[PDB]
Design a protein around this ligand. Structure first.
Ligand SMILES: Nc1ncnc2c1ncn2[C@@H]1O[C@H](COP(=O)(O)OP(=O)(O)NP(=O)(O)O)[C@@H](O)[C@H]1O
Ligand SMILES: [Mg+2]
Lengths: 135, 619
DNA sequence: TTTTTTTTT
């Protein structure tokens, strides 16, 4: 329980059997197609290629460097005070700020806004409150 | 041959005219006068300054370095002979170089055989060292059979002089009379070798780092130890080898050193001294320094005052019978998680010269003090002598390791008596420590001593103890969150939005949060603390009376009156803490005397540390 | 090689 403070996001992976029947059909069809096989931005299926994605990450890291807007900063103060006076810490606040900057980096933005802050808050709640509910 | 002699005469004359010009524009004659007054025997020159007046000498001094350097040292000897000061030193006078190298700035990886015979400048980390040893240069002998005196000179491949001789030690006269050595007249020199490796920031990934061997003599010996980051100037050269008249063609190469530069602190000018006078003459310099210490951390004002007192320090007293009284100050922080304990430790590690950081998680007491490895091996608190040790996660240390510190924190000594080893070691240093409470989080229903959970003999050795609590309170939560977001939205005034990191007062202060009151620059803080550390104040009668009354009041105060609870033990060491804090406060004023104005501030800080109101969960 | 001792992890 000590080192859980050092991690920004936590998930618990966890009744699949009916949905897992469709997943079993898809996965075993993939493996039989792999057996049959045994016998440049986009892939054929519309997903991004690895050779483009790796280069794009290496480009973005050396060039973007965003900041928050003041209106984006105003929401977090109220959210912090409300959660703390209805385990809330400055570590969690700075983690949320880092996630909002990270989302704004992918769009190659000059600034992060209320949109990126709200998606960061949704991701933080969905990840972290599983540990509060479980164990 | 005679043309070579004429050219050498011309080159020596050119260097002599440069050194002993009638009105010296580069002041090397005055530097020679300084050298002979100080008793030193080598002169440092700027190759960039030789490059302006004699470029045909300067660029030839890189390619044909040996002959040019020999001519330059001969010219230096003639320039010394023109003085009215006498040549005391029996070894000759020498030259070192500095300046711009360009092509010949290299690494151990890029030193290759194209550079042999050239002057070079190289960088790296010292990885080995020989002990200093003495080497014969000339020998003087007396012949008792004839009353004559014989002399002989010696030379070696590692010397810059290319000349070689028989190198047999003389024992008999030409008439086969025996001889007697004159040890008081024979000449020896100090000698050392070492090696340098590539810097880890430059060595390519996966491969092993490459390395180069080095030879140093005379005043250049005994200057380095393993781990030093250095820049070294010398001639790159090759050494032949023989075994029974058969030679392998693979020869060894070295650097023969001329000059060494250390890469791993203060600086002053009279404008800076004027500004130090002005700020010392201002109204409240101690409060100004305490506010200016660490601006990007909100709150913690009393702890910042304590850290400033730690950086200044008290006065050691050594009495007439050899008895010693301690001068250093020791500080402990205990508190809830995410309250910037480790952040303040890292800041003090930046500010203090001679500082070391460790953790209690991965430290043995033997490694923390001294070790037997048979040999004796220094630990962290010995290495930080007359300095600062920062210890993080201090609650995670074992008590077997903690009991090894008790001698160091009071007597300033480490004593060992184990198999074959009996020794004292000096370990005079200041301890700054951070910890979490017993339960991992402060329990308000138990007393502060119960939450701290350490014995009185260890708790008494800390001058100041701070308990830091993370209380939920909407006003403080709003203020702290606003400060943190204001520090995160900041960007420098002369910077574009897309960029990435790969005078006296501060001017932009939105990041600092403090709205209007001024803040000093960190460089000015470093200079001011460096000067104020050397002030040596004395005590006075008003201070003595105030301290003596106040100590008795602190001991006799009873806590059942006020619904407070005691945070520290109170012993006779806390009286000395009052004396130390008074002298440390008086240093910041640049005062020669300790007064009631100092002692009142020291009492207020100590009384803040000693007592704490009960938590709101219990109230 | 194998044996015996004292500090360290
Ligand atoms: N004014 C502030 N008060 C408290 N924390 C702050 C403040 N400003 C920033 N922080 C952040 O809070 C954290 C400080 O805690 P830190 O020093 O890293 O560990 P700690 O305080 O020693 N707690 P722990 O090591 O778990 O015992 C950092 O992430 C800081 O950036
Ligand atoms: Mg910490």
């Amino acid at each position: 329980p000590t080192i859980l403070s050092r991690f920004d996001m936590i998930y618990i992976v966890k009744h699949d059997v009916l949905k897992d029947a469709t997943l079993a059909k898809h996965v075993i069809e993939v493996h039989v197609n792999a057996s049959a096989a045994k016998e440049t931005m986009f892939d054929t299926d519309g997903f991004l290629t690895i050779e483009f994605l790796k280069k794009f990450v290496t480009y973005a890291r050396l060039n973007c460097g965003p900041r928050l807007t003041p209106q984006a900063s105003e929401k977090l103060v109220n959210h912090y005070v409300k959660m703390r006076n209805p385990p809330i810490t400055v570590r969690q606040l700075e983690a949320i700020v880092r996630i909002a900057e990270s989302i704004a980096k992918m769009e190659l933005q000059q600034f992060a806004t209320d949109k990126h802050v709200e998606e960061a808050l949704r991701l933080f709640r969905v990840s972290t409150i599983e540990a509060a509910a479980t164990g | 041959d005679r043309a070579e002699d004429a050219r050498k005469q011309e080159i020596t004359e050119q260097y002599l005219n440069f050194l002993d010009n009638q009105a010296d524009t580069f002041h090397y004659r005055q530097k020679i006068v300084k050298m002979m007054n100080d008793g030193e025997s080598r002169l440092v020159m700027n190759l960039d300054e030789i490059r302006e007046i004699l470029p045909e000498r300067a660029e030839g001094l890189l390619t044909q370095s040996v002959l040019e350097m020999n001519c330059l040292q001969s010219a230096l000897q003639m320039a010394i002979n023109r003085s009215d000061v006498q040549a005391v030193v029996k070894t000759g006078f020498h030259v070192g170089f500095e300046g711009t190298f360009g092509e010949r700035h290299v690494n151990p990886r890029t030193l290759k055989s194209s550079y042999l015979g050239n002057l070079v400048c190289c960088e790296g980390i010292v990885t080995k060292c020989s002990t200093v040893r003495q080497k014969l240069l000339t020998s003087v002998h007396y012949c008792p059979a004839t009353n004559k005196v014989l002399e002989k000179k010696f030379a070696d491949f590692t010397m810059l002089d290319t000349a070689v001789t028989n190198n047999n030690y003389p024992t008999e006269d030409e008439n086969k009379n025996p001889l007697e050595t004159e040890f008081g007249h024979s000449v020896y020199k100090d000698h050392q070798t070492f090696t340098i490796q590539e810097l880890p920031e430059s060595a390519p990934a996966g491969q092993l780092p490459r390395a180069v061997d080095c030879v140093a003599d005379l005043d250049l010996a005994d200057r380095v130890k393993p781990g030093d980051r250095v820049r070294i100037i010398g001639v790159f050269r090759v050494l032949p080898n023989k075994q029974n008249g058969v030679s392998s063609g693979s020869f060894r190469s070295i650097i023969i050193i001329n000059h060494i530069q250390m890469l791993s602190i203060p600086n002053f000018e009279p404008q800076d001294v004027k500004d130090v006078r002005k700020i010392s003459k201002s109204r409240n310099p101690f409060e100004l320094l305490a506010r200016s210490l660490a601006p990007s951390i909100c709150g913690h004002e009393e702890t910042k005052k304590a850290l400033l007192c730690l950086l200044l320090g008290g006065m050691e007293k050594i009495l007439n019978n050899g008895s010693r009284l301690r001068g250093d100050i020791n500080v402990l922080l205990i508190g809830d998680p995410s309250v910037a304990k480790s952040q303040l430790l890292r800041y003090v590690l930046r500010m203090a010269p001679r500082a070391i950081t460790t953790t209690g998680r991965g430290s043995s007491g033997v490694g923390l003090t001294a070790a037997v490895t048979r040999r004796l091996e220094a630990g962290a608190m010995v290495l930080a002598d007359r300095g600062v040790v920062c210890i993080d996660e201090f609650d995670k240390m074992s008590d077997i390791d903690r009991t090894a510190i008790h001698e160091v924190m009071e007597q300033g000594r480490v004593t060992i008596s184990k198999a074959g080893i009996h020794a004292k070691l000096n370990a005079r240093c200041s301890v700054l420590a951070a910890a979490n409470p017993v339960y991992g989080r402060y329990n308000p229903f138990k007393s502060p001593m119960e939450n701290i959970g350490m014995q009185d003999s260890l708790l008494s050795r800390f001058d100041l103890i701070f308990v830091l609590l993370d209380e939920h309170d909407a006003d403080k939560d709003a203020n702290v969150a606003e400060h943190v977001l204001k520090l995160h939205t900041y960007r420098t005034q002369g910077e574009a939005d897309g960029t990435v990191l790969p005078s006296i007062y501060e001017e932009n202060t939105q990041w600092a949060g403090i709205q209007d009151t001024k803040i000093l620059t960190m460089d000015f803080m470093r200079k001011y603390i460096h000067l104020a550390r050397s002030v040596q104040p004395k005590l006075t009668d008003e201070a003595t009376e105030y301290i003596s009354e106040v100590y008795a009041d602190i001991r006799s105060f009873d806590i059942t009156k006020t619904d407070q609870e005691r945070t520290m033990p109170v012993t006779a060491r806390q009286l000395e803490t009052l004396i130390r804090l008074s002298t440390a406060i008086a240093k910041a004023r640049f005062s020669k005397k300790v007064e009631r104005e100092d002692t009142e501030k020291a009492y207020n800080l100590l009384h803040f540390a000693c007592f704490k109101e009960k938590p709101k969960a219990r109230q």
